[PDB]
Design a protein around this ligand. Structure first.
Ligand code: CU
Length: 151
């Protein structure tokens, strides 16, 4: 996919653009268009994991019919995590069999020269349960995934 580069202050600014509301380990979105901003292993969080709205691998609740704008930022030095959406649930093998990927980013570039790679994609899901996972061998198997409920 097409990756762009952002400086640290830029990363901070984007993270706060997630318009979901957190409740426990759940982030609920509302409206015609929703904006999900996910990051791979923010400093201080467990490895390996995804952070959405400052929460570790939270369950995302999206209204059916809404246009989902996803922004994925890889803030983890040394690894090129991915954010791929599939219908296949856990447990995941070391080499996850999650085809077909409904929407996703593919492997991201590793942080370099004081910048972090990020990308944006749109998704118009049908009601159902999906999962966002990282395809780097072993990551999903060690907990790098979360659930998406479209209802
Ligand atoms: Cu990963």
């Amino acid at each position: 996919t097409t990756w762009k580069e952002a400086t640290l202050p830029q990363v901070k600014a984007m993270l706060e653009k997630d318009d979901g509301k957190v409740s426990g380990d759940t982030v609920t979105y509302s409206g015609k268009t929703v904006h999900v901003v996910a990051a791979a292993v923010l400093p201080g969080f467990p490895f390996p994991s995804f952070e959405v709205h400052d929460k570790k691998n939270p369950t995302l609740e999206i209204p059916a019919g809404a246009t989902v704008d996803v922004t994925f930022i890889n803030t983890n030095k040394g690894f090129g995590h991915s954010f791929d959406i599939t219908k296949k649930g856990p447990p995941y093998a070391v080499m996850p069999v999650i085809d077909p990927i409904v929407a996703g980013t593919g492997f991201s570039p590793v942080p370099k020269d004081g910048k972090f790679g990020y990308t944006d994609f749109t998704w118009h899901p049908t009601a159902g349960t999906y999962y966002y996972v990282c395809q780097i061998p072993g990551h999903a198997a060690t907990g790098m995934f979360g659930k998406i409920v479209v209802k």
